[PDB]
C-alpha cells in the first residue's frame, strides 16, 4: 500500500528528537500506553482474532492526515480497536459509549490482499536480484524506495514465515517463504542525493526476481 506510512526517503523533516545517550524517560510515558501492545497480543494469542501483520496493515489504513497527527501508541489503540470491530468482537457504538465520545477508526481496506506467489526462486548469498516492479494496494513489506531496484543477497533466512500480503489480510493462502537481506548501494536507491553507503532491506522471496 503506497500510504503515507512509507516514509523512507521523504524529504522535509527536521532533526531527529534525540542526541546520543540522552534520557528517553520511562518505557511508558502515560498510564494507558501499555494497552495497545498488550491488547494486540490478547487478540493474536488469546483470541486468535488476527495476526500481527493485520495490525501493521490496519495502522497503514488510518486516514492519511489522521496517521500523520497521531502519536505512535495511539495509532495502535486505533488499529487494535478497528480490528476488534471488523472481526465482529466489538462494536464502534460500545467503544464510543465507553469512551464518552468519538472514536474514529482506520478506513476499510480497499484490497482483499494477494496469495503467496506460486512462482519464486531460492536465491543464494552473492546473487544479484531485482525487486519485482509490482504495485500492491493492500499490505506489503516492501518500502517503495527499493521497488524495481537491484541489489545483492547477503543472507537467506533459515526460517520461513507467512507472506505478509496474504496474512496481513487474514487470508488462508499465505504459505511460507524465507526472507533475504538484500544489500543496495545508496546510489541505486537515491542517486546522488544521499550521504550513505549501503542499505539492507529484508525482503520476502515473493518480492524478488533474478537480476
Amino acid at each position: 500500500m503506497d500510504g503515507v506510512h512509507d516514509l523512507a526517503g521523504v524529504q522535509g523533516f527536521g532533526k531527529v528528537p534525540h542526541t546520543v545517550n540522552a534520557d528517553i524517560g520511562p518505557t511508558f510515558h502515560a498510564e494507558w500506553e501499555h494497552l495497545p501492545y498488550s491488547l494486540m497480543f490478547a487478540g493474536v494469542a488469546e483470541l486468535g482474532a488476527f495476526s500481527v501483520d493485520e495490525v501493521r496493515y490496519v495502522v497503514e489504513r488510518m486516514e492519511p492526515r489522521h496517521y500523520m497527527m497521531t502519536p505512535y501508541y495511539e495509532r495502535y489503540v486505533i488499529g487494535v480497536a478497528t480490528l476488534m470491530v471488523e472481526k465482529g468482537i466489538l462494536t464502534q457504538d460500545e467503544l464510543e459509549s465507553l469512551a464518552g465520545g468519538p472514536f474514529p477508526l482506520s478506513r476499510p481496506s480497499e484490497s482483499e490482499g494477494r496469495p503467496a506467489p506460486v512462482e519464486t526462486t531460492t536465491f543464494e548469498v552473492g546473487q544479484r536480484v531485482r525487486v519485482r516492479d509490482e504495485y500492491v494496494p493492500g499490505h506489503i513489506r516492501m518500502p517503495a524506495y527499493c521497488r524495481g531496484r537491484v541489489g545483492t543477497i547477503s543472507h537467506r533466512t533459515t526460517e520461513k514465515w507467512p507472506f505478509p500480503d496474504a496474512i496481513g489480510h487474514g487470508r488462508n493462502d499465505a504459505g511460507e517463504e524465507p526472507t533475504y537481506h538484500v544489500k543496495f548501494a545508496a546510489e541505486e536507491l537515491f542517486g546522488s542525493d544521499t550521504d550513505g553507503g549501503s542499505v539492507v532491506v529484508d525482503l520476502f522471496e515473493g518480492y524478488l526476481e533474478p537480476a
Binding site: 506510512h5 516514509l7 523512507a8 526517503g9 532533526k15 531527529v16 528528537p17 534525540h18 542526541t19 546520543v20 545517550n21 528517553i24 518505557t27 511508558f28 494507558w32 500506553e33 494497552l35 498488550s38 491488547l39 497480543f41 490478547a42 488469546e46 483470541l47 492526515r65 500523520m68 502519536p71 505512535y72 495511539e74 489503540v77 487494535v80 480497536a81 476488534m84 466489538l90 467503544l95 465507553l98 469512551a99 464518552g100 465520545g101 468519538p102 472514536f103 513489506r141 518500502p143 524506495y145 543472507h155 533466512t157 514465515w161 526472507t179 537481506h181 545508496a186 537515491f190 544521499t194 550521504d195 550513505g196 553507503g197 549501503s198 542499505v199 539492507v200 532491506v201 529484508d202 520476502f204
Partner: protein, 196 residues
Amino acid sequence: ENAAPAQAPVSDRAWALFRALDGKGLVPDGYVEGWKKTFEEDFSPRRGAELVARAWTDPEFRQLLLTDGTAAVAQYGYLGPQGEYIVAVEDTPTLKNVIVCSLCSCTAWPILGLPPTWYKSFEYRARVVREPRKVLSEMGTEIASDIEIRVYDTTAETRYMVLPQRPAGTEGWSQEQLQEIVTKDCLIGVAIPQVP
C-alpha cells in the same frame, strides 16, 4: 480543510478498548499487567550489552553471535516476542551499521528494550535511510568519509542488533566494566561506546 477528526481523550479511548474486551471475559486476569511488567522490566538493552561484552571477550561466542545470532541469544535465555530470529551485524574500522524500521517501529525488543520515541519518529523513519551520515552527526556521532555506513531497514522478521567495535583503552576490562559502556543507542547503531 485537513482538520483533525473529533476524538475523545486518548486515555478514555484506550481504557474503553480495555473495558469493552475485559467485560466480555476476553482478557485473562492480570494479562495486560503481565505485559506491562515484561515490557518495563524484562525487555532491556542491558541484555544486548551483556551479549556485546561477552562477544568482545570470547572469540568463539563472537563467531556464534555473528553467524547464528538466534542460537547465541538463546544461550542467555533472551529470545522473546519481536526477537525470535536475531541477526547481529558487526561494525569494523571501515563499516558502521545502523538499524531502523522505516515502515513502523520494528525492533529486537527483548535485547534492545522497546524502541524509544525518537526511533519511531517520522524524522528518523524518513531520514536515516537516505542521509544516515547527517542524521548520526546531528545526533552527536561523527562518522568519517571513508567509513561505509550501512542502514538495515527492519522490514520483515529478522530482528537486529549492532555489535560495535570495542574501544581502545578498555584492554583487560571485565565483562561488567565493558557492559557498562554499551548503551541502547550503541545497540541500535546511532552511538559508539564511550570510554571515560
